[PDB]
Structure formats: C-alpha cells, structure tokens
Design a protein around this nucleic acid. Sequence first.
RNA 1: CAUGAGGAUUACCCAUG
RNA 2: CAUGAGGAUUACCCAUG
RNA 3: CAUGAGGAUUACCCAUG
RNA 4: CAUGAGGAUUACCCAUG
Lengths: 129, 129, 129, 129, 129, 129
Amino acid sequence: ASNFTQFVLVDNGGTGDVTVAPSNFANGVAEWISSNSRSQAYKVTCSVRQSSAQNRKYTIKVEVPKVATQTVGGVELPVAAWRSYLNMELTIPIFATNSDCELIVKAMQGLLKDGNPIPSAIAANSGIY
Amino acid sequence: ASNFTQFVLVDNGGTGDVTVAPSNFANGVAEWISSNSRSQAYKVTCSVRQSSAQNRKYTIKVEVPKVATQTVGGVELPVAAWRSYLNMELTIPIFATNSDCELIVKAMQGLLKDGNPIPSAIAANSGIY
Amino acid sequence: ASNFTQFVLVDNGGTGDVTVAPSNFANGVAEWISSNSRSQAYKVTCSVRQSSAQNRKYTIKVEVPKVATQTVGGVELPVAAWRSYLNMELTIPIFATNSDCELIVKAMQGLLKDGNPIPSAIAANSGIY
Amino acid sequence: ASNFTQFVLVDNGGTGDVTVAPSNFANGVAEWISSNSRSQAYKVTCSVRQSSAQNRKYTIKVEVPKVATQTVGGVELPVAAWRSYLNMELTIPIFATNSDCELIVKAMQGLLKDGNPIPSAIAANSGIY
Amino acid sequence: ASNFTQFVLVDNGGTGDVTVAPSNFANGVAEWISSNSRSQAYKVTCSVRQSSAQNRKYTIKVEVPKVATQTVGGVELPVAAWRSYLNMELTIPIFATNSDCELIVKAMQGLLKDGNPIPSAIAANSGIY
Amino acid sequence: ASNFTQFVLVDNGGTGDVTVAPSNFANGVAEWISSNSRSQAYKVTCSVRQSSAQNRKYTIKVEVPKVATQTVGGVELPVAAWRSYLNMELTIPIFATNSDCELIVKAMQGLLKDGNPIPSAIAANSGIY
RNA sequence: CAUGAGGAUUACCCAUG
RNA sequence: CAUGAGGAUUACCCAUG
RNA sequence: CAUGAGGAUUACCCAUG
RNA sequence: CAUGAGGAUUACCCAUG
C-alpha cells in the first residue's frame, strides 16, 4: 500500500475530468497538481501534525483556477485569471478510534452532497436562508 | 429556494442516520444540530461575507462527537477529548459565475470521495505515505 | 419549521387577547411586538449565547405597558403611562440532554401556574408569608 | 391568604411529579426545595422589595438538576455541569393595581405556554430561527 | 416566519425577471444579492435603528449594474461597466401606529407609480419641466 | 408638455385619495403640496444636478403628516402632531440610455411592491428577521 | 504552540493570548 | 467574560472579581 | 448622534452644528 | 463638491476626506 496516489478531483463524468497526481512531499507537505503548466494547475496539499499533547491536526488546501491566455509585452502566456481557495483544518483527539474517524469522514461527505443546503448555496452564489 | 432545512449529515444506509436540523440564525450565522445534548451533538454552522473588494468568503464549521465508549446524555470531560472540529474557509473571487461555483463544489466532493487519499488517511488515523 | 412565529402573550380567552409577532432579528436578538405604535407596544426579546466553555445562557425580556393618551404641547399622542419589566436569564450546562431541558421548561410553567404561591403574591401586590 | 405553602413545580401527570416545599425564611427570602440532597434538589427562592421610589422588584430564582445519567444521592462534580440556574427579576411601578398585576402574570404564563417559541427553543437545545 | 427572503426586484414579466436572494445579515444590515457573478449582481441592503428617543430610521440601498465584459491583455472578466446607486432614509416617529405606517408605504408606492412625474422624469433622463 | 403636474400620492381607492399639486419651482427644486392647511399638508420635492463629470443625481423628498388639532389657551390650530420624512438620492451615470433608466425605475417599484420584504417590514413597525 | 463568521496575490500575513 | 434579594426612562448603567 | 438639491469607486468619505 | 446602517424641528445641521 501507499495512499499517496493520483485521484479525480473534479468528476465531469469521464470526459473533461480533472485528475490530480502526486507532485511533491518536501517538508512534510504532500502535494498534488493537475497536468498543466504550474501557472494554470489545480493544486491540493495536505499535512498532519500532532498540534498538542492530545490532538492531531490535518491542514488541507485546494486551489481551483480560472484558466486564461494573457498577452504580456506582446507575447501569449498560459496564466490563471484568478483562483478560488479552500482551506480546511481538522482537529481530531488522539482518543478517536478508527471508527470514530470514519464518522468524521462521513459527516464531511454528507455536508457536501448534491442537494444539501451548503453545496446548494455556494453553487448559486447565495447565502443560507 | 429557501435552503435552510434539515438534512442527513451522516448517511449510514437509512438505519442509524444522523440528521441535523436548523437550530439558530443569530447574526446571519446559520446553525444545525443533531438531537443530542450540546456536548454530544453534531453541529454545523455556515456564513458568507464579502471579505474584501475582490473576494467573498464562506466560513463553515462542523463539530463531530467521539462515539466509541460514549455514555449517552452523560458528562464527559475534558471536552477536548470527546470532540473533533472541522473549520473550512472557501474564498471565491467576485468574478465567479454559478458555473464556476458548481465546479468548485465538485472539486470539494472529489477531494472527499470514498477511496481517495485524504479521506482514506483520515479514516485510518494516518498521514500521507 | 422555524420557531420564530407569532404567539399569544396574554390569553384573555379569545376576546382582547394580546398577540405578539416577529419584528426584528438584528444583532442576534429576536424581537416580538404587538400591533401598536412602538410607544405603546408589548415587547418580547430573546437571545442565546455560549457564555462559557460549558454553559449556554438565554436572556429573555418582556415589557408590559400601561397605555394612555397624553397631551404634549396641546396635541394628543399615544404613549405609555409606565411599563413593567421582566428580565430573566437561564444558564443551562452543555451536558443537558433534550429531556433535561424539557424538565426546566416544565419547572418554569409550574412556577407560574394559577393558584401557586408566586403568581398569587404578585397578583395581590403582596409578599410571601 | 398565607401563601407560603408546598406546591407542584414539575407536573408529570400525577405520577413522577416534583413537589417543592417550604424550607427557609431567613431574611424575608422564602425558599422551597424538593426532597433531595441539596446538590440534586429543585430549589425556588423568592423575595420582594422597593427598589426605588417608583418601583417594587420581585427576585425569583430557580435551580433545576440535570437528571439524565444522574446517580441519586451521589457526589457529582463539577457542580456547574449538573445544574441549571434561572434568575428572574420583575420590576413593577408603584402605580400598578391588582388588575394590572394580574395581567402581568398572564403575560408570563403566555410567554412560557407549551408550543410557543421560547419554551420550544429551550426544550430543543435551540435558539431562534 | 421570516421576511428575510428571496423576492423579485425587477419584474420583466415572467422571464428576464431579476430575483434577489438573502446573503448576509451581519451587524443589523440585511443584504440581498442576485445570482451569478457577484461583480455583475444587483444588491439591496436594509437596516433599522432608533436614531433618537422619538424616531426610528430605515436606511435602504439598491445598486443596479450595467452588465459588461472587460477585456484586458486578452483576459476577459465579467464586470459592471458602471452602477446606479439608490440611497433612501425613512424616519418614522415611535407614535406611528400600524395604520400610519401603511399610509407611509402607500405614499412611497404612489410617488413611483408609472405615469407619475418623478418616475417619468427618471425613466427619460429628464428633470422636472 | 409638462411633468410638473398634479398627481395622486396616496391611492386609497377613489375616495380618501391624497392628491399633491405644484406650488413652487425656485432654484431647481420642484415642490408639490396637498390642499388645505399648509401646516397639515403632504409635501414632495425633487431636483436633479450634475454631481460630477460622470454622474447626475436626483434628490427626492416626501413628508407624510399625522393630522391633529392643537389646543393652547383655548385657541385651536390645525397642525401636524408629527411628520415622517423620506429622503432619497439616486445617482445615474451619464452613460445610461433610456432603456437603462427604465430598468432603474422598475427596480425601485419592485423594491416597494406589496408583499415584498421591505414594504412589509415598514408597514408593520418592523425590521428584517 | 492557541483563538479570530481576521486578510491574502494561499504552506503566507495580522491581531489577541 | 463572572457575581450582586445592585439601579434604570430596559439589549443599558453601577460595584466587586 | 444631528443637517447638507454635499461627493463617491456606495454600510464609505466631507463641511457645518 | 465627495463618504457616513451620522442627527433633525427636513432643501438644514455634524464628522471625516
């Protein structure tokens, strides 16, 4: 085994999928990037630290770019018009068993499932009401 | 589309599901909690704001109880040993269309999909290797 | 659901009832007022705060006015001769389950039931003896 | 009308009722307690005074025990995790007649009547939404 | 119950309608925003405060954008060519009954009804003549 | 042709209507006043100016009185117990075509249509909730 | 290290403790 | 934030810690 | 907090009281 | 002239730039 593998970040149903692959592990930060120039790539990073005597903290980051072609000094360069960022920190007590952790994973999946409140608000540029 | 409604946070196959329901709306911060004491409840809060002239920011927090060896309705101290905290911040530039935001939601779903690196690590009390 | 609804504050048996309706939620303070000028209205406010690491505190206020018509500078204005105020604070530990909380509600209802000591003293402008 | 008597604080339908009885009268502060250790008892205290030239003030305090997972007669620490505190202050201008005061009692009963917003929120470990 | 809901700001029949939805309600300022790019969205805000002892004051704001596409260096972004701003303050004495407030609303609707002097002037880039 | 004419400010059907008529147009400020005592009359004013190189600005004001009779020393005068004041500024860039201005007017009418959030709050002495 | 419905051009910065 | 059988013209103020 | 037919890039900025 | 969820007794007054 080894869980540092590539995966589908954006599932557009087999055609136009955004897959992301392992690209670096320097300084304890696992990194993944899509097959693009570094200026237009999707990026995912993850690190874990024992943040206290009794806690462990996962720091995860995702960068979603809006690709574009920009003319700088008369020449065309592949660039990112802008980027959206997701920063998440998860603090889990050292007393959580594997089944306690599975519960946390399920909660995160349920939180973002299509049709639920939060993903619905975000996708519609709206708040909760 | 009034989206502030009850939803399934933890899908256990219909039996043993954890539903979370609207519980507070003070200050634009929407809150949902499971049917438990507040010390053992599943809690979800969400809010949106314009962080700067160029960005909007969603702050989403989730609290998940440690269940193994839990005494339902009891007093469990210290609090930090029985609870996990998830803090998510999503920064989206003001130029993002609904389509752009839909793709951002897909990226979040893909990141946590069953079998992928991040959720596998978290569920196995592991890091990346 | 949504518990921010209108309700009968003073039950004079269907004729002369004082109902109070939602009127504001600015700054996390839920407000209710009767259908009157703001100078003669009954008023109810409620807010909840996590006042400590392990407590939650409800702050509730009720204003009962003595309506009157006052001549100021030769003109008649709807005003309140005086007002009676009820301020209550309820501190509940985060360890209280839903059934523990129902117990608190029942205790408050029993405290004020017709015929019992406290409501009897108040209604008679007397103390307890 | 000597009103300092025993009364039913928690009405559970005749079976499992909680009666509270006169227990102290030191300094004009009337007290009632249930038949329990003082750490697990239901306590009610009440006093009246002339707070200023224009007002009279009733101070009513209620203490309710957390019952779920309670060990009858046992030592439960910390105290703050096993008890809820209600503090009520009622300010009534000296011009209030008995009729005025009767209406004030009705407002308090209406505020806490079953099904209304405030008691529903409290009983469901919720706020207003 | 809630009035912090979605509503039609611009009625262009059944199709082409501009709907504005709740987004944030921080510090007493309710805000509504239309869908899609925040940069090209319609915005409405509202708040109320006790400006003095006798007056309450509403502050309402509306922004109408002129949708356009910006192209800089070959990179196009959805923007607002410019915006029209509406700022209105409404002072209402605390003596106003509900009947009085309904009349105030009728006056506001009448001031802007099709065919009347003011909306006709505005709609035609004109003044009074 | 002229838009400085008489118009219905308050439409109470066909009878009880408040009509306001032209009175003065000095220094770029058009003014309309209802009939009878100036002291109890409704007032509307309007003006436009080039606030800067790119913007034109409308300043509209409305006064709604509460009719009352004042009695001082046995001498009664028709007066206004108090007044409600509406002040609105509308900034419209010089690039706005007539089509753009019609949309701005529709937004203003939509903001105040019966049933929508803002007029409902005002009509009920309420804020947003 | 800790907290922030703190910010960012995102493995950085700020405030508080 | 905490306490007061502290006050008020009641979402404020005071004293103590 | 109050006034402005004060301005704006619109919950900000200015003058006066 | 510009900004203020600044106030008013509302074409006035204030603060800031």
